[PDB]
Amino acid sequence: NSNICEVCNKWGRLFCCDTCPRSFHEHCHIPSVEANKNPWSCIFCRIKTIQERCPESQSGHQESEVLMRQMLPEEQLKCEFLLLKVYCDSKSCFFASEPYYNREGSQGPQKPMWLNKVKTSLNEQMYTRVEGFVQDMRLIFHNHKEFYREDKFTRLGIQVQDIFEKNFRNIFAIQETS
Ligand SMILES: [Zn+2]
Numbered sequence: 001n002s003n004i005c006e007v008c009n010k011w012g013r014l015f016c017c018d019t020c021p022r023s024f025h026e027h028c029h030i031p032s033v034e035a036n037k038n039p040w041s042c043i044f045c046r047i048k049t050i051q052e053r054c055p056e057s058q059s060g061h062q063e064s065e066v067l068m069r070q071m072l073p074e075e076q077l078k079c080e081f082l083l084l085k086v087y088c089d090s091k092s093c094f095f096a097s098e099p100y101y102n103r104e105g106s107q108g109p110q111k112p113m114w115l116n117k118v119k120t121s122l123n124e125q126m127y128t129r130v131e132g133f134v135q136d137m138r139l140i141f142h143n144h145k146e147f148y149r150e151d152k153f154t155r156l157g158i159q160v161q162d163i164f165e166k167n168f169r170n171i172f173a174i175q176e177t178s
């Protein structure tokens, strides 16, 4: 097994996957690493199993059809993994906790949003469709763009949004386009 957390790249109290060499902090893994279960398989392994059981699940899909899916167990897992992929980027620190807005020339967003809030919402099964989760994710970055206007700090939102979008297209097998 790896000697650092796959998500945050730090050592510490790590839980090791039984079917792959990744390791995790307890609350770095999504969902939080399960109390018992020997062997234990991480989210990467669980996602790989879905594809292996249904190879056709990797044929291209339309985003509009993906968004309307109900949050059954496999879609719940996919949204968890996509959230985890964003936390894997160190620039996610900017978007993890509850923001505040006091900048000359700007007003805060009507509906603030952040990664830990989306994490709680997934854990509490508050999203009934994939669309719920994706809307909140994209709202994180949209609020950041709007607030920071022409400051160069706006680029952080663009960067972390690109990580989100790339991973969305991969995990949900969105049809490739030009
Ligand atoms: Zn970690």
Ligand SMILES: [Zn+2]
Residues within 6 Å of the ligand: 017, 018, 019, 020, 021, 022, 041, 042, 043, 044, 045
């Ligand atoms: Zn694994």
Ligand SMILES: [Zn+2]
Residues within 6 Å of the ligand: 053, 054, 055, 056, 057
């Ligand atoms: Zn199948």
